[PDB]
Amino acid sequence: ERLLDELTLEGVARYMQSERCRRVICLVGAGISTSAGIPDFRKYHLPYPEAIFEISYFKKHPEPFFALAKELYPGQFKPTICHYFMRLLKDKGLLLRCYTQNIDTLERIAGLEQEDLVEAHGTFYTSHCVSASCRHEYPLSWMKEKIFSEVTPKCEDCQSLVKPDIVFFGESLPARFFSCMQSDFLKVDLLLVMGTSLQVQPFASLISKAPLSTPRLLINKEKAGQSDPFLGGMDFDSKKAYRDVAWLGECDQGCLALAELLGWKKELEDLVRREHASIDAQ
Numbered sequence: 001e002r003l004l005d006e007l008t009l010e011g012v013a014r015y016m017q018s019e020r021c022r023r024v025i026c027l028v029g030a031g032i033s034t035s036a037g038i039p040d041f042r043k044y045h046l047p048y049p050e051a052i053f054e055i056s057y058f059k060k061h062p063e064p065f066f067a068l069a070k071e072l073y074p075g076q077f078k079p080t081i082c083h084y085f086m087r088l089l090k091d092k093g094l095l096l097r098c099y100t101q102n103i104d105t106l107e108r109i110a111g112l113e114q115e116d117l118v119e120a121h122g123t124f125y126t127s128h129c130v131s132a133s134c135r136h137e138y139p140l141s142w143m144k145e146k147i148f149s150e151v152t153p154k155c156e157d158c159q160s161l162v163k164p165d166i167v168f169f170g171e172s173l174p175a176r177f178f179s180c181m182q183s184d185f186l187k188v189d190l191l192l193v194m195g196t197s198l199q200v201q202p203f204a205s206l207i208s209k210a211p212l213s214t215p216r217l218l219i220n221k222e223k224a225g226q227s228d229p230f231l232g233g234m235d236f237d238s239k240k241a242y243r244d245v246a247w248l249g250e251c252d253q254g255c256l257a258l259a260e261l262l263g264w265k266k267e268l269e270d271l272v273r274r275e276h277a278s279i280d281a282q
């Protein structure tokens with residue numbers, strides 16, 4: 001009946017190395033970056049505490065946002081074992097797409113390219129002048145220098161405010177999300193959900209966009225995605241369970257176990273160690 005021979009990580013690895021599994025979509029959240037030192041990120045006289053992340057207030061008073069940005073700026077941008085496992089998926093020719101709710105750029109530092117990524121909530125990687133007639137793009141280095149010097153970032157062409165490409169409250173989701181969703185989920189063979197509680201919509205509903213036969217593996221500290229008894233959910237434990245698997249623990253250790261099952265543990269170790277060595281050497 002089912003594509004997985006058993007509702008275990010071993011069954012998922014066997015399915016992955018079968019000829020049936022060619023296209024893997026990753027859905028990742030804050031949990032895949034806590035081991036990197038980036039925790040769950042989410043005087044100025046704010047009218048309401050959400051104003052610091054609402055677009056209108058930012059364009060009126062951006063200084064609070066950038067003060068918070070200096071306070072939260074990471075001491076290092078070192079992706080995790082999980083990030084590099086996704087890079088390995090890319091190298092092995094199995095990665096259809098990575099949908100991320102994170103803005104910390106670690107997916108790109110790990111070697112995932114823009115075509116590989118749907119950054120559902122944007123990113124700090126790129127910033128743009130807020131003027132529609134200009135839209136000058138600035139890199140993260142420029143923005144970091146502005147934030148650390150405590151100088152509000154202004155466009156060099158038109159002197160307008162420059163905003164990191166994260167999706168503020170009152171901004172729309174990137175259209176790439178919907179277009180890529182409509183195409184990708186016709187093609188997915190395996191859904192790999194890592195480090196997210198699947199509570200924020202519409203990113204959570206993504207799991208219901210997979211075909212009914214598509215196996216779905218959750219690597220997370222706690223079970224998530226099951227239908228809420230109060231209000232296509234994950235079914236790990238019922239007698240009708242057939243495709244959903246939960247590996248409970250650190251995302252790094254779950255990806256290590258999966259790589260070991262796949263025979264990739266040495267490749268993953270070498271990749272992580274060389275990339276971390278190059279980051280430390282900057």
Ligand SMILES: NC(=O)c1ccc[n+]([C@@H]2O[C@H](COP(=O)([O-])OP(=O)(O)OC[C@H]3O[C@@H](n4cnc5c(N)ncnc54)[C@H](O)[C@@H]3O)[C@@H](O)[C@H]2O)c1
Pocket residue numbers: 028029030031032033034035038039040041042101102103104121194195196197198199200219220221222224249250251252
């Ligand atoms: N780094 C970031 O970019 C970041 C951080 C915090 C919040 N957010 C915002 O939160 C929203 C998305 O929510 P979400 O689902 O990503 O977060 P969430 O807090 O709802 O879920 C994260 C999940 O990961 C688990 N987890 C944490 N550390 C883990 C680890 N080391 N190993 C395994 N599991 C671990 C947590 O227990 C939790 O179940 C977006 O609005 C996003 O902008 C982003």
Ligand SMILES: Cn1nc(C(F)(F)F)cc1-c1ccccc1CO
Pocket residue numbers: 038039041065068069070072073074103104105124
């Ligand atoms: C500097 N900064 N500022 C914010 C905000 F103000 F929007 F919350 C988020 C971040 C940021 C940037 C890069 C990596 C990780 C994070 C989140 O810890």
Ligand SMILES: [Zn+2]
Pocket residue numbers: 129130131134135136155156157158159160
């Ligand atoms: Zn400009």
